[PDB]
Design a protein around this ligand. Structure first.
Ligand SMILES: Cc1cc2nc3c(=O)[nH]c(=O)nc-3n(C[C@H](O)[C@H](O)[C@H](O)COP(=O)(O)O)c2cc1C
Ligand SMILES: Cc1cc2nc3c(=O)[nH]c(=O)nc-3n(C[C@H](O)[C@H](O)[C@H](O)COP(=O)(O)O)c2cc1C
Lengths: 255, 257
């Protein structure tokens, strides 16, 4: 005849405590295996003492007063406080404390459900401020790039080695017959290339990536019918899915 | 029954969903569910009792996960396993499950107790935070690779300046225009020493006045360390946000008046 609730508290993964308020200083009279494992204390090392022994230097004094006022008022309380393991390792202890009254209405026990939320209040929180930091830097480093190609008027383009997706500057879109807003793929450039230069272009474009800079020159017939001679100095960014960089310029004058 | 059972109360008041089943009854039905469990699933108390815990399951739920629990229960062994379940509304969620067998003194199986936890949006949050960091790491590194490539290949006199501080960065072409050495530290004052005194006041004021994110141009005369007089044009713009940064492109336009 085993008590299923006793066994539930016994076998749960979540730390639980029970204190007897009728004794002085309201000491711990029970601690499930989960609690002893989290804090690293043995059973005989936590019995008989108040739960304030888990506190330390990083423990917010304001958090302690809240718990004190709740216990003195015999009222429940949920709070996140900084506690310490036997080794010294600090951890965020999500505290859920509930008073237990008898039939008459007198206080009989205090029970609590401790939960280690260190990875939420300490790990996730910094990963949110770390990610936000990267966003600024990413947006900035791009703002420098976009500003240079604009005021220096450079036909700058990028190309994904596999998908063939591209980005083009204002100058690059003027060299070809492109509009400032339309999406640009490697195929929309290939459509402008003269018939005789096409095979040379796509073979160089789909050639095995090397971190070395290379030059390539081909002719295009723009969408208005104007034949233009282009020169391009390109370089591939090594990776699993490389990004090809390239600066194109119109050299039709004096071929 | 004057005094309450603290263990009973602990399970009652906890925010962790907990179930108790009686394996002596057919198909091992639920005989208890704390208020925590009823809020998670959205079922009433009388809508859970007498049922097996498989009613939370449905489509998308891996049948391999079920057989793992099935074999664990049959062997009277504890088991930790995540699984897909369905709350009353139909909303699917991930159920972190911790089941433990309860034996008496004789070794006779009496009960099963469990801990339930909703870890759907929890695991989903971190699997997107670790894929987001990888992308932004590559992007920043590559957008930095793009910048240096353009400046070098296109021979641009490009400089950056922390507006408040005054510390500057200079490209190879930028240093050749003013007449700097490729490895000396460059401050805004270092440039001012070369600017002619007639145009010197007009330069500092224009650089000082505009902290906004509005583009502006300025042209002045300088004299290098060797004495060469050069007319310059600088097109600059400051990036508003936290510690400001002034970007500027300068080209030598030594052409006759
Ligand atoms: C059941 C129960 C469990 C408690 N568990 C913790 C705990 O895990 N960590 C902690 O810092 N305080 C815990 N406390 C609160 C402390 O025992 C103590 O009441 C609090 O630090 C204020 O003590 P003070 O009034 O002497 O300053 C718990 C209190 C109760 C009643
Ligand atoms: C105490 C206890 C709690 C359980 N809780 C769940 C649960 O929350 N979700 C679930 O899918 N299965 C849960 N199960 C397992 C199911 O009740 C069922 O035994 C298991 O899915 C295999 O049953 P089947 O092979 O007939 O499909 C629990 C089992 C026990 C003993």
């Amino acid at each position: 005849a085993t008590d299923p609730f006793r066994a539930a508290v016994e076998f749960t993964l979540m730390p639980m405590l029970i204190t007897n308020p009728h004794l002085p200083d309201n000491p711990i009279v029970f601690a499930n295996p989960a609690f002893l494992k989290l804090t690293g204390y043995e059973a005989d090392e936590v019995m008989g003492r108040n739960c304030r022994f888990l506190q330390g230097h990083g423990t917010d004094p304001a958090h302690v007063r809240a718990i004190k006022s709740a216990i003195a008022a015999e009222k429940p309380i949920d709070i996140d406080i900084i506690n310490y393991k036997k080794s010294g390792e600090a951890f965020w202890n999500r505290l859920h404390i509930s008073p237990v009254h008898n039939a008459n209405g007198r206080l009989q026990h205090f029970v609590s459900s401790q939960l280690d939320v260190t990875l939420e209040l300490s790990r996730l929180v910094e990963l949110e401020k770390e990610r936000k930091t990267l966003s600024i830097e990413t947006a900035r480093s791009k703002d420098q790039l976009d500003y240079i190609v604009e005021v220096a008027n450079i036909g700058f383009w990028t190309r994904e080695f596999y998908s063939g997706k591209m980005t083009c500057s204002a100058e690059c879109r003027r060299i070809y017959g492109f509009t400032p807003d339309e999406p640009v793929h490697f195929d929309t450039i290939l459509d402008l290339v003269v018939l005789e230069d096409r095979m040379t272009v796509v073979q160089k474009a789909h050639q095995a990536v090397t971190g070395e800079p290379y030059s390539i020159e081909y002719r295009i017939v723009t969408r208005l019918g104007e034949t233009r001679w282009l020169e391009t100095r390109a370089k591939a960014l090594t990776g699993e899915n490389p990004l090809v960089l390239g600066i194109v310029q119109d050299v039709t004058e004096r071929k």
